[PDB]
Every structure is written in structure tokens, then in C-alpha cells.
């Protein structure tokens, strides 16, 4: 009824410990969601074309051209680690767990409140808020996954991360097909390159409507909506990282000399002349058996063209890479292609007392050593005469195509049947949790945005919309906008996310890396004297595991 | 209760496939309906007489004289194709099906909201909207078809075609009896032709009221009304067209000289002199057996007097024709009598963002070839002397009654026992779906407005009305209009229309016509940058079928 | 999820576009470029890569001689202009048993190039490589364009 509650607030985390070292992590998240009525009740096909920014030669990477359908519906997205776990929960998980499974997900909407706003004619403005007990909130769950998948973590538009702060749903939109061409250039290119928006291919048009595709529930103040429990079918996610590159695979060489006194410069020596050694190499025209030249089982990682931009029907885009840079852990300034950079607002980690439109940003440097250090690569002639001469070697300091700033490693790909690589680590709190698999016939081996990828399906998207609240002057044949009472809704959202994790075992004599509080990061986890909060980022794959 | 929803919004279309190539098409439509309190609570008997327009000689076809009963009720009519199908569903139906059956219809009203309007006495006007929880909406279902049948598609007054656009019902009115005489004339006619409204014949007076004939349900904010499933008894509707005229029935003549080379002018020849041929003709006094004179089983189509106006007690009206014109499919400018013209507004297809009172119009050119090419006909004397002389042939070029613009084909009827014709095709989105059969002893073979005609009876009309909300100063003895609290209602209408259709089969080597999205019509099916929408007319009988 | 448009058009026409509104270095989102603040449609992270670039009209040799390197996807812009159909678009040559007009004389086969509706190809004239630093606007020495020998 009007005065009866339809649900309970729960933002607790439960750790039920099953048999055989497994734990059943249940994460409950409850939010107060504020929803305003849409700016228009209509679907808009809008086209963006920043020809002013791209008309500057050399700015082709700043292209924003696209077409999208703008919908009156809003999306309630909880696909971010911060919606479920606070820093203590994350510390427990990443310090005590070895692997993580995604089990089930359910959500519900309860305690719906719809209000109206009326402004007086008094010369000094004043306005009052009234309940509309008969107003309804439209709710649609796309359980069949008919609508385009639009995960909000990409735009930092999921639900907030604080149980005690109200949150909002992101207005919903999806990409409408367009054709675009942009010929790249540089500062000093003669003429204006081709920079044209071509229009839309009729064979690719897809105008989706929530009304025509999803059942819609009308909720009054006494109604509730529950989705039911969806069960995932994803692969396990590892909370451990690999440090072994190809140089650390297999039996090391026997040291026929070992140091007799401890010290930095007291090295051990193999003691066998290099071309007189025993072992296996994949180089049939040399007798040198060295650490660089000895055969290894396979490859760990792969070189890829970095900051390579590829063009298709819709315009340029960056070629994605599955691993981060080498040497970035030692020097953060060297973090580059492959190290994901997140920008976010005050709902999602930025100090809440800060003023200004500038977001908080961090580049996520992962602990796994699967990257490449391109400054250390080189090609050389098949003859393999050592020491190598200038004409028989290609170094990263060597111009490709006549350019002093482009070398061979920029256009270099070594992905092959021998490549081994890991899935992307989880990123707390701004990282996406699960992603839908592409509907291509042949599927990618991994996703760069989520550690969990859904094979068959995973949960439909939850859309909300304040139902139209018309005045007495409505005329559907009028060309002007709809006359509506200023109406908005506040409703409570509760979700349950279930994980299954495996407790870790100490395999080594030494202790491992763990997340801890210290004097430096002490005040990143508590409120300020004026109530400000922040959620800094945390690394996930702390513990090391042996690759081979 | 006040805060509990009484129904769910559903506007999906389901295609459940059955055995033997039959599909159970379930179309769901849900609207938000805006209803105002009527201008008056009283029934009116109103006479319209545009003597000014018909006083000009030659304007008799512009007669608008009639008498109607203006009721305070409003009609919730969903009897148009666009209320149930969007362009994609229509494409699927018309491209993959051969015949359509109308099965069942049901509708329900839920989530009733009644609001009142109050205007402040402040010098700058302002007004507020309040909920009247005790107010009622009067709902009447005429399940016994006691009231006159007044389908709204004929006036373009059905529910809107867009699920996301609130719609309105049409104020209900029905014809009263009147006697009218209007003697036709032309510019230059001497004197004033008789143009007189005669009154009402008492033997034909029929004054229907909803209250004395139909149960009325008083719905408060927490109430819902459901009609119950109705089941039709109509004939199947064909989604194929016939191209065979009389000239294309039977066995073509044997060609004794087949062409020896490709080309447009490389024709074949029968090779037998026309007066020495074998076959059957109904011309017992001539030896010529020619394609025009050879016997055929029956007649496909018929000639009717076109732009003929017939006068009965109530005044002139156009004589309808079951088939369209000939040659109109090659030249749209030749579309005339028989090709329906639909004039509609922004609720029913006209681009919603356009201003002005001008309606959107289209003339439907059916794919069927059952029409006539009146300028290709002629009549000649029974003797059949060829080549025919002037005095023995009546041509469309020749005058009738001394008129240079009227020829014998204007007064010509060739309907007979040998006439074969087709039913009217569905017209999307603006066409009627079903119509009621006339209560005459002898009934028409087809209706020219709806492909489905209801043999016994079919669903009762749904009437809605805001119950009077009186002030404290009501006095039934006063002659002035009742003083009411300005009240309007918004309620949700959901309807389910079920069809049965048969999947088509390929019977020919060549492919057939299909409706498709192309670069020309691409933007008729997607919204504009400011939300504009339109629904364009689509043909229905795309595939051909052999008549004989 | 496309970017939220803070400015929407108020009239219909070819010059009425929508605007994101947020300055490019002030935007929120995820990029795979740890050394820049620019979140743009060409730089924002995507789940994976649709299609791939392959060496086109590449001939490789083995024991039996040279053969073309096959490719799984067609070209970009082939649908827009059929004269651009190239590597990746299968070209079929056939005679009068298998489709060629049967009444035509001569030994010339009937041919067509198949342009698929799937958009998984590439527009190599639109690709470019630029130095990791990513200083914009890019200068000549720090970009490798398809126009470069």
C-alpha cells in the first residue's frame, strides 16, 4: 500500500566458508536512486561532428564523429567493483584468495516515491514538493538481451560507490550506424585531408525501442520489482600474477663457479665457453647457446603495434593491446599503451569535497610481467655474425619510412601460435566486472575491459523512466513538445552479487606481497573533517604464481 | 488500492510457429490515453448545413449536410493496422506470409489517474494540478452492439501509432436521420437548384444513450477494467495479388514461328491466318479467333460508372468501386476512382515535427490488376464488320448527352454473373482491420474499407467518460450548464490482437517482390535529430499468385 | 555506450549537430593510453577488436612456389564504391553451365566480385602510427602515414 515498505536496505558483505577451502562471497548493495523525467519523451537520432578539432592537421586521434539514438529511458548499471566491495572487503579478497568465480546476480527496486514540483507566482521565487500517489515509474528488464549492450563503466556512469550517498541512473543511448572517413595528417601537411561524414548505410540501420522489445512494469509507491537470480557461466578469474618471462622458463644453466664471499659484485660464472655449451636452440646455424638464444617452451606476451590507429567504416580507432608496458612498474612515467587509464568523478572515487570539472585519474600498472620493453628489441640478419655490424641489424633507434620518431617496433607484431598471455586483472573500484561476448562467429580470446566474459548470456539491462504526467492541455496533434507536470522519482535499488573464491596457500618460504594500511595512505580510507570521501584504486593480483 | 498498479505495459509482437507452416501472430499494444471532461454532460442533436458552399452551382459534391447526436462519451478505438504493427513487423508479415486470419481481440484499462485543475486568483495567472483519489472514470463496453458502429479509421481518429506517444480518444457521435434534397447543377446553370434540408422522418428516429443500453463501470484510481477475449468469424485475407486479366487466362496460342535472335523487336508469330484458326468464341457471327475475341472462363473485374453520385433520402453520395484504376501503377498521376486516398495527421503517420493544419495524404495503388483502363474500351455493332466504321463503334472519345467531357464509360456497368474480383488489400498503417456486416437481408460481397468483415458480430465498442465532479452550488432546476470541477483523466489502455498466418512458398524460378529498406526511404523509419517520427504507407499484397 | 551529449539540436537540418560539451581532456572514461588525458572516440577503450589488418597483395613462398597470403575479411569502402573492391573480396569467374548467359558466344568468362554486407574490413588509407609520447597535433617525424614510402 501507500504506507507500507516493500523492501529492506542491505549493503553487507557475507563470507560463508564452504568445505575444501572455498568461500561463498555474497555482496549486497543498496542505493537511493534519483530519477528525473526525460528532457523529451521522444527518441532522437543525433550526429556529432567535431570538424573544428579534426580540421587541425595532426589531430586525427581526437575524432568524436558518431551517430547515436538518444532515448528517454535511463539505465541502472551496477557493473563496477565499487558498487559491491569497500576497501576492507577488497583487501580481504585480494590478500586471502587465489581465484575468483562469478556465480549469480539479482537486483530489485523497492520503495518507489514519485513527487511533483510547483512554483509560486510570488515575486520572490518559491517552490513546493508534493507526493503523487497515483504516478507510476516505468521499469523494463531486457532479460532476452535484445537491446544493444552499453556497459556504463566505460563512461564512469555506473551507480555510485557509497551506500550512504544517493545516486542517479545514466541516460541511455546506443550507437546508430554511420559511415566516416578521415585521412590522417601532420602539422605541415599540404592541403586539408579528406574529413567527411558519409551518412548511414540502410542495410545496417537498427532503431531499437524499449516499448516494442521489453515488457514494461508500471510501479506506484506501493509496488516492487525483482528480476530474479541470474547465474553466470564464466571462466575463473585469477588473483595471482605471473612474473616469468621467457628468460625464466626451464632449467637454469649449471654454474661451474659460485661466489666465495657475499657482495653485490660477487657473481657466479657458468664457466663453459659459449660455443662449447650443451643445450637446445632454435637457431640451426650457430653454436652459441646463451640465455637469449636457448630454446624455451613458448612465448610469454607478444609485441604489438603501439599507438596504432586503424580505420573502418565508422572511422579511426586505437588498436587494442592485451598487456601493459615493460619497465612501467619501476618508473610510472613510462606507463603507456596497454596500461588502462581511468578518469572518474565524485560518485566513483574523486574526493567529494573537490570543486571543478577536472576528473580524478589513475593509470593501472599491473603486477604481471607479460609486457614488452621495445627499446630492448632488435632484428638482425640470418647469418648471425657476432658482434653484429651496422648494416646487418635493425635497432629501435632506427627510422622507419624516413621518420626519426618511428622505428620498427611501432609496426611490429609477434603474436603467433606460441603466444601465452593472461586475462586482464580486475581494477578496483572503477573496473567493469563482467562483459558480454561478441556475437561474431569467431570470438576474441579475452576482453580488455572485464575479467569475466559471458558465453551464452548475462543479465539483461534494467531501464527506468518516469511515466508521463500530463496536464489538462495535451494535444497529440501539436507539433510542439509535450506539456508535462514537473515530476521526478526517488526509489531504492538493492542488488545481490555472489562470488566463489578459493583461499590461498603459502607455497614458498618467503612472505608474499599484501595490501596494508600505512602512514601514507592512512587518510585515503576515512572521511574528512567536512565529510569528504574518496576511493583510491587497489591492485588485484598481488600474490605471485609460477607460470611454468 | 491507491498506490498499487493494476496492469503492465506491453507492446511486443510475438510470432509463435505451429505445425504445417502456420504462425500465431500475437500483437500487443499499450497506450497512455488522455481524457478530458466533455464540453457538456448533455446529449445534443446538431444539424450541419453548408448551404453557402453548395449554393455555388457545380459544388454539389461538396455537400456536408447531415444530422448527428453529439454524445458526452468518448470512443477508444484501436481498429487500425498501425495501432498493432510497426514497419518491421509489417515487413515480416507481408514478405514471409501468404494469407492472414483474424482470430481474437481483447483490451483492458488499467492505472486510472484522475486529476483536477485549480487556477489562482493572483494577478499573474498560475494553475496547479491535484489528484482526486475519489473521482471515477465511467467505462462502458457495448458487448451486445446495441449502439451504432462508428469506427474511427474513416476519420483518422483511432489511437495513435507510437507506443511512446500519449494518445487521446475521439469524442463519440452518431448519425441522426434527416431528409435532404440537392438538385445537381453546373457553372452557368440558370436559377438556383433546389437545395433544401427537409427535417427528420419520425418513423426513423433512433436516439441511443449509453446509460440506458450498456452497463457502466465506475473505475477509481485503484480499479481496472477488462473486456474479455472476443473471437472472430471472418474469412481469410490474402497477402498475394493477382495479375491475370482476361487476356492472360488459359492456353496461349501456339507459335508457328519462334524468334531466331535476341532483341526487343524480335517477336514471335502465330503463323495461322486469323480467320482460319481453331478455338472457341462467343461471337457466333464471325470467324475471327483473336486474343481479344477468344472465349475465357469468366470476367476478372468489372467496369462501373466512375465518379458517379447517387441520391437517396439523405443526399448525394459517391458510388463505390471494389477495384482501382488501370495504368495507375505505371503513372501515379492516373490514380483515380477506386484507389483509396488516406488523409491523416501527426498521430497517425504525418511527420510529428511539422507545423500547420495541412494533413499528410497518400493514394494507395494496389498491386492487383483487377481494374479497368476505360480509355481502352469500345462498343461496336453486332455485325462485326472490320475495320469498323465510325457509325458502328462507340469510343471513349465520343460524347454522351452532348457533353465533350462525358463518355459512355462514365455510365457503364459490366458487373454480371461472370465477374470475379478480389477483396480489398490491407492498407498500412492507416487502414481499417475489421468491419461489421450490414444488417440487411441481402449483404454485400465485400467491404471496401476493411479486409475482414464480421459475419455475426464483433467486439463491442469501448466508451469512456469522466464522471461529473460537482461543486457545492449544483442546482438541477437551473437551466445553465452544470458547474463542474475541471477534471481530466489519464489511463493506460492495453489491447491484444491475435492473427493466424500461413508462411509462403516459392512456386517459381524467379524471386518475387519484397518490401525492403533502401537509401531512398532509409529515413522514413528512424527518428530525426529533434525526435520527429513518421510512419509511411506500405503495400501488403507483394507476392503474386496465379488466378487461373 | 556512446558519450552523453550535453547539447542537443533544436532544429532539423544538416548543420544541426549534437555536442558532448565536456572538453576532451576533462572527460571521464577508460582508455588504454596511460600517458594522456584525451578520452575521444578514437581513444576510448573498447572490449576487443572487430577485424584485423593483414598484409594485402602479399605473396609468400614455400617449397612449391609463391602463393597469395589469404585474408578473411573484405576491404573498407567497397560497398560505397564497387571500383574499390580488392584483396579480400572473392571474385568468381564462370561459364555457361554455372551462370553465364547461355546464348553468348566466345571464350570470355562471366565475372563478378562479391562485396559482402559485413563491415569487418579496413580502410588502410585511414590508418596511422604515431610515437608513444602522443603529443598533439602530431608532427611529421612522430607519425607514420599510409602516404609514406
Amino acid at each position: 500500500g501507500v504506507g507500507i515498505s516493500t523492501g529492506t536496505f542491505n549493503n553487507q558483505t557475507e563470507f560463508k566458508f564452504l568445505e575444501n577451502g572455498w568461500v561463498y562471497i555474497t555482496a549486497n548493495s543498496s542505493r537511493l536512486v534519483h530519477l528525473n523525467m526525460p528532457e523529451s519523451e521522444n527518441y532522437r537520432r543525433v550526429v556529432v561532428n567535431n570538424l573544428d578539432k579534426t580540421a587541425v592537421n595532426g589531430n586525427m586521434a581526437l575524432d568524436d564523429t558518431h551517430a547515436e539514438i538518444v532515448t528517454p529511458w535511463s539505465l541502472v548499471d551496477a557493473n563496477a567493483w565499487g558498487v559491491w566491495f569497500n576497501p576492507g572487503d577488497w583487501q580481504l579478497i585480494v590478500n586471502t584468495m587465489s581465484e575468483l568465480h562469478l556465480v549469480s546476480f539479482e537486483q530489485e527496486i523497492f520503495n518507489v516515491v514519485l513527487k511533483t514540483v510547483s512554483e509560486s507566482a510570488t515575486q520572490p521565487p518559491t517552490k513546493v514538493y508534493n507526493n503523487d500517489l497515483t504516478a507510476s515509474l516505468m521499469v523494463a528488464l531486457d532479460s532476452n538481451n535484445t537491446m544493444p549492450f552499453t556497459p556504463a563503466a566505460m563512461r564512469s556512469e555506473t551507480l555510485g560507490f557509497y551506500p550512504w550517498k544517493p545516486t542517479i541512473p545514466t541516460p541511455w543511448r546506443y550507437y546508430f550506424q554511420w559511415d566516416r572517413t578521415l585521412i590522417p595528417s601532420h602539422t605541415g601537411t599540404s592541403g586539408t585531408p579528406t574529413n567527411i561524414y558519409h551518412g548511414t548505410d540502410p542495410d545496417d540501420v537498427q532503431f531499437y525501442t524499449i516499448e516494442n522489445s521489453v515488457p514494461v512494469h508500471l510501479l506506484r509507491t506501493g509496488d516492487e520489482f525483482a528480476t530474479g537470480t541470474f547465474f553466470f557461466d564464466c571462466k575463473p578469474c585469477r588473483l595471482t600474477h605471473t612474473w616469468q618471462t621467457n628468460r625464466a622458463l626451464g632449467l637454469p644453466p649449471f654454474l661451474n663457479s659460485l661466489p666465495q664471499s657475499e657482495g653485490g659484485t660477487n657473481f657466479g660464472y657458468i664457466g663453459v665457453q659459449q660455443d662449447k655449451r650443451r643445450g637446445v636452440t632454435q637457431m640451426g646455424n650457430t653454436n652459441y647457446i646463451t640465455e637469449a638464444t636457448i630454446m624455451r617452451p613458448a612465448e610469454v606476451g607478444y609485441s604489438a603495434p603501439y599507438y596504432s590507429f586503424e580505420a573502418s567504416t565508422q572511422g579511426p580507432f586505437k588498436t587494442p593491446i592485451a598487456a601493459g608496458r615493460g619497465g612501467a612498474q619501476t618508473d610510472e612515467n613510462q606507463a603507456a599503451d596497454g596500461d588502462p587509464r581511468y578518469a572518474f568523478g565524485r560518485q566513483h572515487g574523486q574526493k567529494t569535497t573537490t570543486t571543478g570539472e577536472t576528473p580524478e585519474r589513475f593509470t593501472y600498472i599491473a603486477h604481471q610481467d607479460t609486457g614488452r620493453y621495445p627499446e630492448g628489441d632488435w632484428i638482425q640478419n640470418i647469418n648471425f655474425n657476432l658482434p653484429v655490424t651496422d648494416d646487418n641489424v635493425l635497432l629501435p633507434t632506427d627510422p622507419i619510412g624516413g621518420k626519426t620518431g618511428i622505428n620498427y617496433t611501432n609496426i611490429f607484431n609477434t603474436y603467433g601460435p606460441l603466444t601465452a598471455l593472461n586475462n586482464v586483472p580486475p581494477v578496483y573500484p572503477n573496473g567493469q566486472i563482467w562483459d558480454k561476448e561478441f556475437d561474431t562467429d569467431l570470438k576474441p580470446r579475452l576482453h580488455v575491459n572485464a575479467p569475466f566474459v559471458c558465453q551464452n548470456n548475462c543479465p539483461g539491462q534494467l531501464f527506468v523512466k518516469v511515466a508521463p504526467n500530463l496536464t489538462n492541455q495535451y494535444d497529440p496533434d501539436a507539433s510542439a513538445n509535450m506539456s508535462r507536470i514537473v515530476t521526478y522519482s526517488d526509489f531504492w535499488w538493492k542488488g545481490k552479487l555472489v562470488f566463489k573464491a578459493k583461499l590461498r596457500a603459502s607455497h614458498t618460504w618467503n612472505p608474499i606481497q599484501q595490501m596494508s594500511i600505512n602512514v601514507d595512505n592512512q587518510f585515503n580510507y576515512v572521511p574528512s573533517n567536512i565529510g569528504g570521501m574518496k576511493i583510491v584504486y587497489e591492485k588485484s593480483q598481488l600474490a605471485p604464481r609460477k607460470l611454468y | 488500492g491507491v498506490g498499487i498498479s493494476t496492469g503492465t505495459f506491453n507492446n511486443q509482437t510475438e510470432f509463435k510457429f505451429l505445425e504445417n507452416g502456420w504462425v500465431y501472430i500475437t500483437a500487443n499494444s499499450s497506450r497512455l490515453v488522455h481524457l478530458n471532461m466533455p464540453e457538456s454532460e448533455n446529449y445534443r442533436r446538431v444539424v450541419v448545413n453548408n448551404l453557402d458552399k453548395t449554393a455555388v452551382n457545380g459544388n454539389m459534391a461538396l455537400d456536408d449536410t447531415h444530422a448527428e447526436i453529439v454524445t458526452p462519451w468518448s470512443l477508444v478505438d484501436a481498429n487500425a493496422w498501425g495501432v498493432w504493427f510497426n514497419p518491421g513487423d509489417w515487413q515480416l508479415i507481408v514478405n514471409t506470409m501468404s494469407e492472414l486470419h483474424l482470430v481474437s481481440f481483447e483490451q483492458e484499462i488499467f492505472n486510472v489517474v484522475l486529476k483536477t485543475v485549480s487556477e489562482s486568483a493572483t494577478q499573474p495567472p498560475t494553475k496547479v494540478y491535484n489528484n482526486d483519489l475519489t473521482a471515477s472514470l465511467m467505462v462502458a463496453l457495448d458487448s451486445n452492439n446495441t449502439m451504432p458502429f462508428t469506427p474511427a479509421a474513416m476519420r483518422s481518429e483511432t489511437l495513435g501509432f507510437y507506443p511512446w506517444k500519449p494518445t487521446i480518444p475521439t469524442p463519440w457521435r452518431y448519425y441522426f436521420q434527416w431528409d435532404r434534397t440537392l438538385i445537381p447543377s453546373h457553372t452557368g446553370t440558370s436559377g438556383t437548384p433546389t437545395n433544401i434540408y427537409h427535417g427528420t422522418d419520425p418513423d426513423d428516429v433512433q436516439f441511443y444513450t449509453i446509460e440506458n443500453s450498456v452497463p457502466v463501470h465506475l473505475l477509481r484510481t485503484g480499479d481496472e477494467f477488462a473486456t474479455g477475449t472476443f473471437f472472430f468469424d471472418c474469412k481469410p485475407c490474402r497477402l498475394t495479388h493477382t495479375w491475370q486479366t482476361n487476356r492472360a487466362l488459359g492456353l496461349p496460342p501456339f507459335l508457328n514461328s519462334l524468334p531466331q535472335s535476341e532483341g526487343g523487336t524480335n517477336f514471335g508469330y502465330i503463323g495461322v491466318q486469323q480467320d482460319k484458326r481453331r478455338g472457341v468464341t462467343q461471337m457466333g457471327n464471325t470467324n475471327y479467333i483473336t486474343e481479344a475475341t477468344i472465349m475465357r472462363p469468366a470476367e476478372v473485374g468489372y467496369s462501373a460508372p466512375y465518379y458517379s453520385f447517387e441520391a437517396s433520402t439523405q443526399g448525394p453520395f459517391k458510388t463505390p468501386i471494389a477495384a482501382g484504376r488501370g495504368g495507375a501503377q505505371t503513372d501515379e498521376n492516373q490514380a483515380a476512382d477506386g484507389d483509396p486516398r488516406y488523409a491523416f495527421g501527426r498521430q497517425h503517420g504525418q511527420k510529428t515535427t511539422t507545423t500547420g493544419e495541412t494533413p499528410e495524404r497518400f493514394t494507395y495503388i494496389a498491386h492487383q490488376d483487377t481494374g479497368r483502363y476505360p480509355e481502352g474500351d469500345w462498343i461496336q455493332n453486332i455485325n462485326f464488320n472490320l475495320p469498323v466504321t465510325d457509325d458502328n463503334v462507340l469510343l471513349p472519345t465520343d460524347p454522351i448527352g452532348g457533353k465533350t467531357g462525358i463518355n459512355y464509360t462514365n455510365i457503364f456497368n459490366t458487373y454480371g454473373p461472370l465477374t470475379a474480383l478480389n477483396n480489398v488489400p490491407p492498407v498500412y498503417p492507416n487502414g481499417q482491420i475489421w468491419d461489421k456486416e450490414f444488417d440487411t437481408d441481402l449483404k454485400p460481397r465485400l467491404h471496401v474499407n476493411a479486409p475482414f468483415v464480421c459475419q455475426n458480430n464483433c467486439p463491442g465498442q469501448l466508451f469512456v467518460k469522466v464522471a461529473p465532479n460537482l461543486t457545492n452550488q449544483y442546482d438541477p432546476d437551473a437551466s445553465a450548464n452544470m458547474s463542474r470541477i475541471v477534471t481530466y483523466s489519464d489511463f493506460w489502455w492495453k489491447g491484444k490482437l491475435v492473427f493466424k498466418a500461413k508462411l509462403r512458398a516459392s512456386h517459381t524460378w524467379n524471386p518475387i517482390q519484397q518490401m525492403s529498406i533502401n537509401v531512398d526511404n532509409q529515413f522514413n523509419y528512424v527518428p530525426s535529430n529533434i525526435g520527429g517520427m513518421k510512419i509511411v504507407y506500405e503495400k501488403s499484397q507483394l507476392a503474386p499468385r496465379k488466378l487461373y | 555506450l556512446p558519450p552523453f551529449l550535453n547539447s542537443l539540436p533544436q532544429s532539423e537540418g544538416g548543420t544541426n549537430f549534437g555536442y558532448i560539451g565536456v572538453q576532451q581532456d576533462k572527460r571521464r572514461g577508460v582508455t588504454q593510453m596511460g600517458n594522456t588525458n584525451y578520452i575521444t572516440e578514437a581513444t576510448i577503450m573498447r572490449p576487443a577488436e572487430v577485424g584485423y589488418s593483414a598484409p594485402y597483395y602479399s605473396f609468400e613462398a614455400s617449397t612449391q612456389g609463391p602463393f597469395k597470403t589469404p585474408i578473411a575479411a573484405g576491404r573498407g569502402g567497397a560497398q560505397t564504391d564497387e571500383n574499390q573492391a580488392a584483396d579480400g573480396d572473392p571474385r568468381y569467374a564462370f561459364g555457361r553451365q554455372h551462370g553465364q548467359k547461355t546464348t553468348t558466344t566466345g571464350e570470355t568468362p562471366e565475372r563478378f566480385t562479391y562485396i559482402a554486407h559485413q563491415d569487418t574490413g579496413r580502410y588502410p588509407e585511414g590508418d596511422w602510427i604515431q610515437n608513444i609520447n602522443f603529443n598533439l597535433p602530431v608532427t611529421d617525424d612522430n607519425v607514420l602515414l599510409p602516404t609514406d614510402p
Partner: antibody
Framework: EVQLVESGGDLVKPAGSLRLSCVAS????????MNWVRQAPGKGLQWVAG???????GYADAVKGRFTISRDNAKNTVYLQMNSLTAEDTAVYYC????????????????????WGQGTLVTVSS | SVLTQPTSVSGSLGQRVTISCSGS????????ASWYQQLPGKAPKLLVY???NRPSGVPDRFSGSNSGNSATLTITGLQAEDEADYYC???????????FGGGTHLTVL
């Protein structure tokens, strides 16, 4: 090779109306826009109007309130309708094709005529 | 919006010729000019695109460049084939209006 042919030239009164037509061939007609450019005697080229695949049109400020342009992709034909003509409209009108593929509402951001017809003469006088 | 061109330009056989077209940030500063050739009484012919490319069969003699709000057409190795009239064409994206220049007559000495 691409080829265009125009027609419709005539002499009309200082306040009449006229209609012109071009026929095209040799390319994907629906993919490229077609434009009307005129040249007064002894003067330079002047743009009149252009129409794209979906029927969207653009008119110069000199003719925006008077003229109308249309297509028929099933017939590879482009028409121009002129109303309320004045003496200044006298010129030879040339029918041309765009180098760039644009179809819908958002054209006229990059135009470059790559093929041309033969031209037709329009004379406005008493 | 209108573009500006010099009335005439003169060059001698074998020399270099330059023709200049001036516009604004609204027309040439976003979409560069495209250059056309017109023999007396004949239909125009496109010479150089806005990006410096030429239609198939146009000699490399013809070249173009864009700087700020001004564009230029350069004809190298002037031959007797080049005596004609030349025009600059640009489109205004703000208004959606195609803009031609006034035209320049080329004299070969």
C-alpha cells in the same frame, strides 16, 4: 565512364517559371550528390542547388526562397524547378556530380564536383 | 560568403604560375579550395582536389596548397595547353552553401 546530359532550356517572361532535367549514367547514382551550378554571361560560376540520395536539398541564399530540386534514383535523373524568375537568373546551368559519397541529411560539409555535363541555357526576358 | 580571386595572372612558357584564392575560417579554413579549369565556352574540369590530389590523367604540373584562409594553385612548366580560366571552389559548413570564386584568366606568354 561517367556521363551527364542536361535539357530544359527555354526563354520565359520576367516573372515566369521553368524546369530543367539531367540524365546521368556510369556510377552508383544513389551514392553521390548532384548539383546545379550556373554561369551568367561573361561572369563566373554560381551555385544554385544540390540534392542528395534521400531527397535532402540545399539552396543558395539567392534561390533559397524560390527554387526546388529533386531526384529519382530509379531513373538516374535530377530535376530543378524555378519559380518567380527574374532577369538576373539568365545563365547557362551546368549539372555536375560530387566526388564524395554522401547520402542523408548531413551533406554539404564537403563538396567537390568531379564530372560535368554539357549545360543548358536559361534566358529571362520580355 | 564569397571567395576572392585576382582578375588575371600572367606567365611565360616554361615558368611557374601561381593563382591565389582568399576566403575565411568559415569556408577555406575548414574545407580547402578545389580548383577548376574552363576553356572558353566549355564545361569546367576539375584539376586539384581540396587535399592536393588530382583526378586521373591530370599532369603533375598542377598542384595546390592551403594556408590559413587562403589557397593557391601552382602550375609548373607552363605549356600552351594551359591558356584558360580557373576558379576556386569551397563549401561553407556553417551555412551549408557552396562558394565559388570570381575566376581568374591565365595568360601564357
Amino acid at each position: 565512364e561517367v556521363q551527364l546530359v542536361e535539357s530544359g532550356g527555354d526563354l520565359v517572361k520576367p516573372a515566369g517559371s521553368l524546369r530543367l532535367s539531367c540524365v546521368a549514367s556510369g556510377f552508383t547514382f544513389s551514392s553521390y550528390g548532384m548539383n546545379w551550378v550556373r554561369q551568367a554571361p561573361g561572369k563566373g560560376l554560381q551555385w544554385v542547388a544540390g540534392v542528395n540520395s534521400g531527397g535532402f536539398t540545399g539552396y543558395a541564399d539567392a534561390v533559397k526562397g524560390r527554387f526546388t530540386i529533386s531526384r529519382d534514383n530509379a531513373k538516374n535523373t535530377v530535376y530543378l524547378q524555378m519559380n518567380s524568375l527574374t532577369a538576373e537568373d539568365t545563365a547557362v546551368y551546368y549539372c555536375a556530380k560530387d566526388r564524395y559519397y554522401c547520402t542523408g541529411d548531413y551533406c554539404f560539409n564537403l563538396i567537390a564536383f568531379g564530372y560535368w555535363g554539357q549545360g543548358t541555357l536559361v534566358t529571362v526576358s520580355s | 560568403s564569397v571567395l576572392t580571386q585576382p582578375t588575371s595572372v600572367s606567365g611565360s612558357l616554361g615558368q611557374r604560375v601561381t593563382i591565389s584564392c582568399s576566403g575565411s575560417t568559415n569556408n577555406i579554413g575548414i574545407v580547402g579550395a578545389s580548383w577548376y579549369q574552363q576553356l572558353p565556352g566549355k564545361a569546367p574540369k576539375l584539376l586539384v582536389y581540396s587535399d592536393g590530389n588530382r583526378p586521373s590523367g591530370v599532369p603533375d604540373r598542377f598542384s595546390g596548397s592551403n594556408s590559413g584562409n587562403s589557397a593557391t594553385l601552382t602550375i609548373t612548366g607552363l605549356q600552351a595547353e594551359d591558356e584558360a580560366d580557373y576558379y576556386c571552389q569551397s563549401v561553407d559548413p556553417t551555412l551549408g552553401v557552396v562558394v565559388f570564386g570570381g575566376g581568374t584568366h591565365l595568360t601564357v606568354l
